[PDB]
């Protein structure tokens, strides 16, 4: 009824963006790039406005509105908090990739956000 505990929130994050990530062939955007971010504590909300920055790509829709979940304040096309720095872009695939080790890190220390 009330929504789902932190820890299994993430872990039913983790479950489905690796399922995504297994079976994919090509990238899931058209080759689509993402500025790289540092991952420490906001990484769901400096994760997220990079998200912003790709469009028509379905397949991570549903993804943004999960690191959403982790991060109460929305990013618009226009608003940027972690782009200040001229970091170089990264393929997609990477970034989840990356992403994805630093997801199951914060659970084994149960410390969510």
């Known amino acids: 009824m009330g929504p789902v505990p932190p820890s299994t929130a993430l872990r039913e994050l983790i479950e489905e963006l690796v399922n995504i990530t297994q079976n994919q062939k090509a990238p ?9 971010i540092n991952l420490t504590a906001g990484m769901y909300c400096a994760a997220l406005e990079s998200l912003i920055n790709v469009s028509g790509c379905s397949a991570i829709e549903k ?3 999960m690191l959403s979940g982790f ?9 940027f908090s972690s782009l ?19 997801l199951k890190k914060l659970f ?3 410390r969510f956000n």
Request: charged share 25%.
């Open 28 to 36: 899931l955007c058209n080759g689509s790039m993402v500025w790289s």
């Open 63 to 65: 993804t943004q509105r």
């Open 71 to 79: 991060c109460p304040h929305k990013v618009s096309a226009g608003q």
């Open 84 to 102: 200040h720095v001229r970091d170089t872009k990264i393929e997609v695939a990477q970034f989840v990739k990356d992403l994805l080790l630093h």
């Open 108 to 110: 084994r220390e149960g």
